Amino acid sequence: EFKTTPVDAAFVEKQKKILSLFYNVNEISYEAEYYKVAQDFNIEASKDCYTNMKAYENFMMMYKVGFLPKNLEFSIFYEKMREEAIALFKLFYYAKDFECFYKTACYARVYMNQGMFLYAYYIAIIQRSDTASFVLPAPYEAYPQYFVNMEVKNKMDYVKMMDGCLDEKICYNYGIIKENEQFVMYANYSNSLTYPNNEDRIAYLTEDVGLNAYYYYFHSHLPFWWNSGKYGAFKERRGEIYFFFYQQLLARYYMERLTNGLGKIPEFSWYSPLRTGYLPPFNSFYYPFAQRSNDYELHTEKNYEEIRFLDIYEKTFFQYLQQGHFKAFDKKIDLHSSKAVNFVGNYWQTNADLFEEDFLQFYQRSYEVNARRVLGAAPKPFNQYTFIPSALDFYQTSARDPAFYQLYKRIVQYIIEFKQYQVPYTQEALHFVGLKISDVKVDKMVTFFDHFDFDAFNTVYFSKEELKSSPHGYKVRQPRLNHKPFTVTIDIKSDVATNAVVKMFLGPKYDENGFPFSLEDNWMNFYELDWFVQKVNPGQSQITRSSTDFAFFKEDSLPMAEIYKLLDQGKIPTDMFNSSDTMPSRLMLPKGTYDGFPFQLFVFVYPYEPTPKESEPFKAVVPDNKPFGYPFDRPVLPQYFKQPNMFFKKVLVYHEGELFPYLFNIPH
Amino acid sequence: TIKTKNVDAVFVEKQKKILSFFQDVSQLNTDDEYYKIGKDYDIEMNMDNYTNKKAVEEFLKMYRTGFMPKNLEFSVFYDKMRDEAIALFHLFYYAKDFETFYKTACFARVHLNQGQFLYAFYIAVIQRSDCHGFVVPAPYEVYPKMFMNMEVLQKIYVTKMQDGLINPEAAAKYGIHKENDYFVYKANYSNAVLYNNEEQRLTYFTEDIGMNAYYYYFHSHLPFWWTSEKYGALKERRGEVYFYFYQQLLARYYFERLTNGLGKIPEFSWYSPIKTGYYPLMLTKFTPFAQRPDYYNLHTEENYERVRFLDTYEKTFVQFLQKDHFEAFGQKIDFHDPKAINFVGNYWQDNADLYGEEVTKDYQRSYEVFARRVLGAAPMPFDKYTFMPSAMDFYQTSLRDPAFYQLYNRIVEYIVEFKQYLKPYTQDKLYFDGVKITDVKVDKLTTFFENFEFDASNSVYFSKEEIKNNHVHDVKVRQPRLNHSPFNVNIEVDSNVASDAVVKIFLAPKYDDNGIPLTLEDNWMKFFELDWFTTKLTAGQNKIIRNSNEFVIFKEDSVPMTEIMKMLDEGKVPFDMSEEFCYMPKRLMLPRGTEGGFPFQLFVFVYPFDNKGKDLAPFESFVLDNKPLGFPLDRPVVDALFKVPNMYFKDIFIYHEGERFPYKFNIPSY
Ligand SMILES: *[C@@H]1O[C@H](CO)[C@@H](O[C@@H]2O[C@H](CO)[C@@H](O[C@@H]3O[C@H](CO[C@H]4O[C@H](CO[C@H]5O[C@H](CO)[C@@H](O)[C@H](O)[C@@H]5O)[C@@H](O)[C@H](O)[C@@H]4O)[C@@H](O)[C@H](O[C@H]4O[C@H](CO)[C@@H](O)[C@H](O)[C@@H]4O[C@H]4O[C@H](CO)[C@@H](O)[C@H](O)[C@@H]4O)[C@@H]3O)[C@H](O)[C@H]2NC(C)=O)[C@H](O)[C@H]1NC(C)=O
Ligand SMILES: *[C@@H]1O[C@H](CO)[C@@H](O[C@@H]2O[C@H](CO)[C@@H](O[C@@H]3O[C@H](CO[C@@H]4O[C@H](CO)[C@@H](O)[C@H](O)[C@@H]4O)[C@@H](O)[C@H](O[C@H]4O[C@H](CO)[C@@H](O)[C@H](O)[C@@H]4O)[C@@H]3O)[C@H](O)[C@H]2NC(C)=O)[C@H](O)[C@H]1NC(C)=O
Ligand SMILES: *[C@@H]1O[C@H](CO)[C@@H](O[C@@H]2O[C@H](CO)[C@@H](O[C@@H]3O[C@H](CO[C@H]4O[C@H](CO)[C@@H](O)[C@H](O)[C@@H]4O)[C@@H](O)[C@H](O[C@@H]4O[C@H](CO)[C@@H](O)[C@H](O)[C@@H]4O)[C@@H]3O)[C@H](O)[C@H]2NC(C)=O)[C@H](O)[C@H]1NC(C)=O
Secondary structure (H helix, E strand, O other), X not given: OOOEEEOOHHHHHHHHHHHHHHOOOOOOOOOOHHHHHHHOOOOOOOHHHEOOHXXXXXXXXXXXXXXXXXXXXXXXXXXXXXXXXXHHHHHHHOEOOHHHHHHHHHHHHHHOOHHHHHHHHHHHHHHOOOOOOOOOOOHHHHOHHHOOOHHHHHHHHHHHHHOOOOOHXXXXXXXXXXXXXXXXXXXXXXXXXXXXXXXXXXXXXXXXXXXXXHHHHHHHHOOOOEOOHHHHHHHHHHHHHHHHHXXXXXXXXXXXXXXXXXXXXXXXXXXXXXXXXXXXXXEOOOOEOOOEXXXXXXXXHHHHHHHHHHHHHHHHHHHHHHHOEEEEOOEEEEOOOOHHHHHHHHHHHOOHHHHOOOEOOOOOOOHHHHHHHHHHOOOOOOEXXXXXXXXXXXOOOHHHOHHHHHHHHHHHHHHHHHHOOOOOOOHHHHOOOOEEEEEEXXXXXXXXXXXXXXXXXXXXXXXXXXXXOOOOOXXXXXXXXXXXXXXXXXXXXXXXXXXXXXXEEEEEOEOOOOOEOOHHHOHHHOEEEEEEEXXXXXXXXXXXXXXXXXXXXXXXXXXXXXXXXXXXXXXXXHHHHHOOOOEEHHHOOXXXXXXXXXEEEEEEEEEOOOOOOOOOOOOOOOOOOOXXXXXXXXXXXXXXXXXXXXXXXXXXXXXXXXXOHHHHOOOO | OOOOOEOOHHHHHHHHHHHHOOOOOOOOOOOOHHHHHHHHOOOHHHXXXXXXXXXXXXXXXXXXXXXOOOOOOOOOOOHHHHHHHHHHHHHHHOEOOHHHHHHHHHHHHHHOOHHHHHHHHHHHHHHOHHHOXXXXXXXHHHOHHHHOOHHHHHHHHHHHHHOOOOOHHHHHOOOEEEEOOEXXXXXXXXXXXXXXXXXXXXXXXXXXXXXHHHHHHHHHHOOOOEOOHHHHHXXXXXXXXXXXXXXXXXXXXXXXXXXOOOOOOOOOOOOOEEOOOEOOOOXXXXXXXXXXXXXXXXXXXXXXXXXXXXXXXXXXXXXXXXXXXXXXXXXXXXXXXXXXXXXXXXXXXXXXXXXXXXXXXXXXXXXXXXXXHHHOOOOOOOEOOEOOOOHHHOOOOHHHOHHHHHHHHHHXXXXXXXXXXXXXXXXXXXXXXXXXXXXXXXXXXXXXXXXXXXXXXXXXXXXXXHHHOOXXXXXXXXXXXXXXXXXXXXXXXXXXXXXXXXXXXXXXXXXXXXXXXXXXXXXXXXXXXXXXXXXXXOOEEEEEEEEHHHOOOEEOOOOOHHHHHHHHHOOEOXXXXXXXXXXXXXXXXXXXXXXXXXXXXXXXXXXXXXXXXXXXXXXXXXOOOOOOOOOOOOOOOOHHHHOOOOEEEEXXXXXXXXXXXXXXXXXXXX
8 A cells, every 4th residue: 555665686685684683683593694693793803894993992891891681671761771872873883884784783683682782773774874765664563562562462472372372262252363374463452450540531642553653763863862963954953853843742642632522731740749640561571660650749758869850950941031141051042043942952852962962971961861760650770770661761652651741741831931032923924925825625534443463573482493484473453543535725826936835734723611722822732734845826726735645644664574575576665764753644633523523724835945955864854944833833923824825724523433442352 | 288289271281181081980981072082093193293103013013913802800910911001101101292192092091991091091191201290099099999898899889770878777877878969988997897817907007098009109100011211320229129118018017017916927938838818808890809718739730830930030049149249131240239239129020120121021021920920829811811810910909918918028038138248337337426316205106097088989880871961979988097196206416516417217116026125136127217308417406306297208198089170270289199199108107006005116317418429309309318228227237336326216105096996987876
């Protein structure tokens, strides 16, 4: 069903080598290539495999000491682990060419903590300019322990131990099936036993594998601990990107709330109990994931110190706001400019750019890191290498915890407070002389659930014999949200002839009241659907635009088994290649109602100014000097959003078939 | 004996026009001149009759957007309403001459919200130079619903709905009488139906109408959102006026506490419950005010972000104190400099001058604003124009709420922490060479309660017929109010050489709650300025007699608007309403005494008046001296370093005569 890209022979050889490191991630095949290359790899005598000598020797000092042991949980939020992951990434990134890169990777895949390897290896592939174009397995196929609820994981573990189904018919009743000599396990989203509250209404978005992958992808595309100088001109906009990402995400998430009768994201206080608990079905074969009960007191003895830190980190920000202008971190900052937006984002992410340095240093403490440690509820790590995990310890599980949206809602609000310093758009900056939208029409917008498979073979262990054949075929089936394709047609009257930018946004039409939202208090609640350039004709014309073409949404990842078959034909999937860090299509729309749920479609047309000729860290970076989210990057005066080149359309989002996903997983 | 002032027919005309906007405030007379001009008035077409072209256009832009609807409650404490008020004020203030000014008010009365209009208009009349010398009715005549509980209000309403008394004799037992063509309504203070805590002892003060109108006057004279550019060298002393205003008022409040056996205003925490609540019995148009129960948790869900703001505001100040010298707001500040008081006060009020701008902005969040919203215990506003009012949303009701005094005492305490950095005055600074006060003597000081009536007609809605016929002034409210007897202060001064001099008179407590004499060291901020004036000393023996009645810090009671119309037919205007409108009322000068005589003390100070280097007369002739406000008690004191022969401390007692409880004035006789 998917867009393909023709791909030559050199590429296929390289892509295959790359993907082969993601097979049976959790054990070592004594007969696989990677193993022999790892053994043949004298790390000692090959300084000249690397661009950077310092990076080489740095890693060696560390490696003579010792790294995180195999099998333990890896998380980039713990200091010593991060420093080790960064050293290994430096190695991957400074590899002279693809050969040295492969060897290093084989070496690491054999002698190192697998989680740490996967983390570093992912990022390296995305960042190395000679690997820029190659494809990666979806995060749920590489780390399926972070995307599988415990019940399913155990069902698989016991099937492996049994060497298959004793009796097909008991198995069937447990949602276990044979298909083409592969096992398929049906999976429910977790019940009130996992979210002991209203937030369980939404488990089908928060547990969704696309959504969690998406977040993992956004991190790997530009990690907080790294410099953004590789993207040149983009560096001046890093904080802008950080805001936009969370604002969009939270806007999307709030829409799911509204359709499930849920309202505003609750606000919290470090000095008070947090209402909404989280109980994850995940474990690290050592500790189960830390639970957070309902009405959990954040301010208990073990958190006194971290809360102190988080409290000033926030209040320092308030003091910025109060002072208008001030020196911070070298700079003299004036909150009336855009060198400001960037700073503000960088401030809140304590990323490398905030310090003007290449990598985060040992001792520069992160607000997000401690926010997450406090909200995560875990007892304090036992030592350097051993912590008790929580959902907030990983990019791939973060989106599962209600507290995650509460934490980012807090940051995003503080940025909105800053945005009140920004001067609002005027009639002249928004009006498109001689152009008018006369109508917008939209096809029926319909959501629904349907089944989706992935290979979870990575959390299953195989024998020496089986390993010789690199084995898979442990598939998880899950209902996932989705929508039917639709067309937006825009009608435009115009006087003369230029390229135009067409932008589409989705916003709520009413609050939980039933009361119309006014733009003043809604601009933050619009998420972008699309961006494209158009040749405008004199007079009357119609722009037709299908959802399947929307610039900010991707098709589903193919599993490796399918990737391998495409590669066999000279093909790869475009979206996994050209745009992995984009949200999946199926999640484009929030679950509707049979009824039809009322939202609004915002259609913007403005003149196109041919600019930037760049090299993109995200697909959110479109070749335009306008802000991200423009014209909804800042406070609005509602009376300038009546230009003829704007159209707000009421749309209703329908739903079809079963409303509850669990009815998709019932036996006979 | 109401202190008069004569005036010409041109003045009379203008004054009538100003007064018209204060009658029948919530309604419109289709037949009146103001409406005809108002309805039809084209601002854009009259661009050239305004000093400031940008203000006209700023206003036009907002007015095309829509302004607050009629009939909703207006408070300056919310961004959008404030911004509309200010764009309106600017229109009033930049009108080229009176004619344009007048016509603009006409337009604004026709088209804008009543509260927003009255607010802007009142300030305009005070600020406009060509209006200097003109008179405005007391705020209780304009917003009478804000100076009375709902009991009286409902009687007024019932009578109006009936178009009279169905049973004069039954009405009598509710304190309602016809007198002339007036309906007269006796009113109690709220403690007569409500004793929910010890703070209700202080109602005849905190609910007093003059005391409340006085706060409103202070704010209108110089609102926080506006520059003080127009007041000359006041600009360099704004923060000083801010501090002193509250310091004085809190001293006066404190006296009322003392004489009612209550001691010190309690300290609070934005993270803890606040003990004493506030149950308001006022109504507005479509809601009651918000209640704060006792033990209200300031730190609930809804206040999280607010308290984070409030908490950071304070700590920023604390950081200033720790630093001594710092750069902030684009100014180098040194806390050893006594002049820093300008910045300190400006910081706490978050006024326009903190930033050196004409007008404050939404993104410059105010401390006082957010503290008021937190302690008021109202729920989140419904939208930008629909809130639930608490006493602290208005200058005319704030003094009613115990929390009000707790809030400003907190700020004033913080300013006092700054004053710790100031070097105490030495002997040489205070010593008047060759001058000694040899005796002070005071007539008996005695308070009493006494009936006072005001026009409450704006609280009522009138019919078509009545409005046409000007029968629109028939509702009076009578209420016992504190007063004291006039008294003389006799001061015998000795000086070798003749010399021009300043004499200051303060009032202070004698003891704390334990009955230890208060020492200057701890209690120099507990002093209340009663009077200042100059005399000429001569060689030898001097005797200065000063009547309380000539104390310059206080004014006489306002006259009703009704008597001003009568006066204006004689070519007269009430002097104290013209030049002395924003002074504290005279009759509340002394705290309520006790039958046995509660102990206070007078401080009398005499010092040299050799010239007049720096003196204020733009704000008004308050500080005819380059001396700090509240000199010689504007910084901390060391007892030994302080006492000087031209100072004198005299023990006095304040008595009370007649009924001690106001409600005893309001019993019907049988
Ligand atoms: C129970 O509760 C409900 C829900 O809260 C209450 O409902 C509220 O009722 C309000 C009326 O009291 C109402 O507000 C009015 O709505 C009018 C219509 O609003 C629409 O249109 C305007 C402008 O018109 C143009 O719009 C389109 C788009 O360009 C054009 O194609 C059209 O052809 C028009 O040219 C838009 O701006 C709005 O967004 C709406 O879509 C308003 O026009 C009207 O505004 C007037 O009043 C303001 C203050 O009074 C004033 O600032 C403004 O300038 C307007 O002035 C006119 O009206 C006054 C009297 O109001 C008149 O004397 C003047 O001469 C002048 O012509 C109102 O604001 C609320 O919309 C509504 N709330 C909701 C959610 O619907 C309900 O009242 C309440 N009932 C009871 C019994 O309590
Ligand atoms: C302001 O606040 C003050 C303080 O409360 C109010 O004062 C009260 O006013 C009320 C009602 O107007 C007064 O009540 C009347 O008292 C009358 C006489 O004194 C009493 O003698 C009786 C009878 O034997 C004793 O038993 C009592 O203890 C009293 O001392 C009394 O004649 C009268 O009776 C009327 O009402 C009853 C209802 O049961 C009928 O039976 C009877 O026919 C008659 O109609 C009242 O009860 C009350 O005394 C006042 N309070 C105090 C403390 O003295 C003011 O009214 C308030 N002013 C305003 C304007 O609100
Ligand atoms: C994902 O989540 C869904 C929802 O939780 C879950 O669906 C549930 O599945 C169970 C079985 O898997 C199912 O119950 C089975 O129910 C049937 C239907 O029974 C109906 O008719 C009864 C009268 O004849 C009536 O009493 C019932 O209320 C119901 O309407 C029933 O035939 C089965 O009977 C029992 O069989 C078991 C065998 O273990 C015996 O222990 C027992 O003695 C009975 O003979 C059995 O109960 C249940 O109804 C579903 N829940 C809902 C809410 O619809 C999925 O299984 C889960 N899927 C996966 C893959 O995880």
